[PDB]
Design a protein around this nucleic acid. Structure first.
Ligand code: XC5
Ligand code: CL
Ligand code: CL
Ligand code: CL
Ligand code: CL
Ligand code: MG
Ligand code: MG
Ligand code: NA
Ligand code: NA
Length: 326
DNA sequence: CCGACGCCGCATCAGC
DNA sequence: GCTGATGCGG
DNA sequence: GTCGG
């Protein structure tokens, strides 16, 4: 937190541009600046010093100078004062309300938590769940609770079929001391890039977790991705744990390493690695790394037997998950 | 100066 | 129904 | 908003 004041400023700017301006590239520009400053190992003393970093340009350098001189940014002070912007920013904090729905709601005069409750009939299913658990979804998950959740998921998956492999990814696999949610990568030998020899592979796992009352609600569910809600069991007389977001990704077993690279993140790390891949003539998704032809169309998948193989193709030194939290 | 900015699953809607 | 575009979030 | 060519 050497530069926490500056990085906070940039994150609030990114959030404004995404939620209010609906300018996604400015959102990513600010987040990239925040990320490169967050790993800068000195306490930044000037905008000129910051502008040396890749992704900090003239405009952000000027803002950093204003912030360093005064402790504030007038642009943000004005934004915090604006009723419509503040209302749109707030509504997007509900899971399932994005910038478009938030502005639509605010236009209809729906601007507060109380307004959302009174107008629950105007919400789709995802948004209704996000409003129901708004408070809980604001709380972090201590790693100690992540470890308990991991134990339940891995044991329940094993009971369905001992040939499943479940891997907790996301910030947890990066070693974080707390997480916003739980991300579970799932494989089964019957599901590969070549064939699907069994149906309902994800369904069966979801059903087992619902059966033991771990999964409590479903936000979305398809053949390979589940997004929903779970809760640790509590003891007699003890307050219930907060409800938590969980999302599960079933990945073809022969594409495990591309999948665990993707699901480990961070999101900014994935964007930077995939951008570097492109510069090196490759494209990376959660399934494959493919070379780009002379016209730039993806070729055939390249052999991959470890995460490190993917780094080697694009000429990056390997980075352990804990060093991927960008 | 300017185009390019990672890549994709699921829910929902419009148009047919 | 299906396809394609869009919103949202992983 | 930033940057590479
Ligand atoms: N825009 C995105 C978003 C996510 N991903 C990948 C990388 C991320 O780590 C994983 C889980 O996302 P999550 O949304 O769960 C974020 P995570 O890194 O797990 O941190 P927490 O806030 O503690 O959950 O999904 C991506 O590639 N592109
Ligand atoms: Cl933009
Ligand atoms: Cl401020
Ligand atoms: Cl792979
Ligand atoms: Cl692919
Ligand atoms: Mg996560
Ligand atoms: Mg997640
Ligand atoms: Na720079
Ligand atoms: Na939201």
């Amino acid at each position: 937190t050497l530069n926490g004041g500056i990085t906070d400023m940039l994150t609030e700017l990114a959030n404004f541009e995404k939620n209010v301006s609906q300018a996604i590239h400015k959102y990513n520009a600010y987040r990239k600046a925040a990320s490169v400053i967050a790993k800068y190992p000195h306490k930044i003393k000037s905008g000129a010093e910051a502008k040396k970093l890749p992704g900090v340009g003239t405009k952000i350098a000027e803002k950093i100078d204003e912030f360093l001189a005064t402790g504030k940014l007038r642009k943000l002070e004005k934004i915090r004062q604006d009723d419509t912007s503040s209302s749109i920013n707030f509504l997007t904090r509900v899971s399932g309300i994005g910038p478009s729905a938030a502005r639509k709601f605010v236009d209809e005069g729906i601007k507060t938590l109380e307004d959302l409750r009174k107008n629950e009939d105007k919400l789709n299913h995802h948004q209704r769940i996000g409003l129901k658990y708004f408070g809980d979804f604001e709380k972090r998950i201590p790693r100690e609770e992540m470890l308990q959740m991991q134990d339940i998921v891995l044991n329940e998956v094993k009971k369905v079929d001992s040939e499943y492999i479940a891997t907790v990814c996301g910030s947890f696999r990066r070693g974080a001391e707390s997480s916003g949610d739980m991300d579970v990568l799932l494989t089964h030998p019957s599901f590969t890039s070549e064939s699907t020899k069994q149906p309902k592979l994800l369904h069966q796992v979801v059903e087992q977790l619902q059966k033991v009352h771990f999964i409590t609600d479903t936000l979305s569910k398809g053949e390979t991705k589940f997004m929903g809600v779970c809760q640790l069991p509590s003891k007699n007389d003890e307050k219930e744990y907060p409800h938590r977001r969980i999302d599960i990704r079933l990945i073809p077993k022969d594409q495990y390493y591309c999948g665990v690279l993707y699901f480990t993140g961070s999101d900014i790390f994935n964007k930077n690695m995939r951008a570097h891949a492109l510069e090196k003539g490759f494209t990376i998704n959660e399934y494959t790394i493919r070379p780009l032809g002379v016209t730039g169309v993806a070729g055939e998948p390249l052999p991959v037997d470890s995460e490190k193989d993917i780094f080697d193709y694009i000429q990056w030194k390997y980075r352990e998950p804990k060093d991927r939290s960008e």
